[PDB]
Amino acid sequence: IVGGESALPGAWPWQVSLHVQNVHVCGGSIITPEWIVTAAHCVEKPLNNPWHWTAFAGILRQSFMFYGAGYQVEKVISHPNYDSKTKNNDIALMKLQKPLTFNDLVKPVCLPNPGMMLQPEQLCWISGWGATEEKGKTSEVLNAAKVLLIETQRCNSRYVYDNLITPAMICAGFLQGNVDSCQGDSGGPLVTSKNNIWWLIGDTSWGSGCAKAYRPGVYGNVMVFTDWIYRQMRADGEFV
Amino acid sequence: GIECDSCINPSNWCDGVSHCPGGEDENRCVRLYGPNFILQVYSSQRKSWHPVCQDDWNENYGRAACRDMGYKNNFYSSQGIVDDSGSTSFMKLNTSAVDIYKKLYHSDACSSKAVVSLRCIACGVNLND
Ligand SMILES: *C(=O)c1ccc(NC(=N)N)cc1
Ligand SMILES: [Ca+2]
């Protein structure tokens, strides 16, 4: 997160840190006690196997994620139509071995429903432990920032992303820059408040640099993915 | 026609009989609509989604709708609310009956004047408001 501020406890209770080899790699979002929404590029081979992955919830500081606080990941499911080259359909699911315990520090974010009637420049929030500067290091503290939705027509302009934004993607940020997601924020939440409920509208996917003008953040369009998410969750419920 | 990652005839989509090798035509027949979580069911005859009437709806029916949606044993809340989805047709529950979506029938009104608002999990709440 570039241009943001440090998050308070319980401010983003759905945010998790995803670890491999005792090191933060990606963000994710709790939607049930068992299921986490993250990005498919986080789990490209060799990190497609679930045993590499640990999730930390309710902890703001990376140095406070001690050995024993993590939840072991049991399943990793990348979107079947993920494209490494274009980052199209950049979403994946992670199921934990043991269900999370929900309280003021750890709660799920709501999956978006059809008919949210979001504004074209809807006010949104992003959070994560990503770098606070382009090409910088992983942040010790969880940060968050306000970003506005950017209509795909404007984002696909010749001077922004030039037709690279697919219907499975949305843009959020500022065309002037200075406030953006960055390396290590990917897989994390893009959320908006509506009807006094926080909704997950995006998962942090890619972008050209960080906080550069005319290069806003691109997010997996979680609305497009809900049908796939529900089928995965129902299919797992019927056992496998 | 609707494709299931192979397309199927529309009257056989959400008609209670699986026709796709993976079953995609019968496993996404319940849905929550809008910021008020209005419960909706797909009508194969009308090729459209329609809200469920509050008439004779109870918790155990909502829990089954939550199971169909993939939330397993998660259930948070269910109440009748005034429909804000701008619908003109509804799905009214027949008691003499069977999966949730196979238990409803088309109605142009609801006796209670309410539709089902269903929340399968307590989500979306943080420190503020
Ligand atoms: C993920 O780690 C990630 C997502 C997005 C960006 N770039 C921008 N948001 N401009 C970098 C890294
Ligand atoms: Ca069928």
Numbering used by the authors:
A (entry chain C): 256 to 495
B (entry chain A): 117 to 122, 126 to 216, 219 to 250
What does the paper say about this structure?
Host proteases, TMPRSS2 and CTSL/CTSB cleave the SARS-CoV-2 spike to play a crucial role in the two alternative pathways of viral entry and are characterized as promising pharmacological targets. The entry of SARS-CoV-2 depends on two distinctive pathways, cell surface entry and endosomal entry, where the transmembrane serine protease, TMPRSS2, and endosomal cysteine proteases cathepsin L/B (CTSL/CTSB) cleave the viral spike protein. The crystal structures of TMPRSS2 and CTSL/CTSB in complex with the potent inhibitors were determined to reveal their specific mode of interaction.
In light of the crystal structures of K777 and nafamostat complexed with their respective proteases, we devised a bispecific compound, named 212-148. An ethyl linker was utilized to construct this bispecific compound by connecting the pharmacophoric groups of K777 and nafamostat. As expected, 212-148 not only showed potent inhibition for CTSL/CTSB with respective IC50 values of 2.13 and 64.07 nM but also suppressed TMPRSS2 enzymatic activity with an IC50 value of 1.38 μM. The ester group in their common guanidinobenzoyl moiety then reacts with the catalytic serine of TMPRSS2 to form the acyl-enzyme intermediate and cleave off the “leaving group”. In Calu-3 cells, 212-148 inhibits the SARS-CoV-2 Omicron BA.2 and Delta variants infection with EC50 values of 64.4 (SI = 5,391) and 235.2 nM (SI = 1,476), respectively. Although its anti-TMPRSS2 inhibitory activity decreased in comparison to nafamostat, 212-148 showed nanomolar potency against Omicron and Delta variants while maintaining good cell viability.
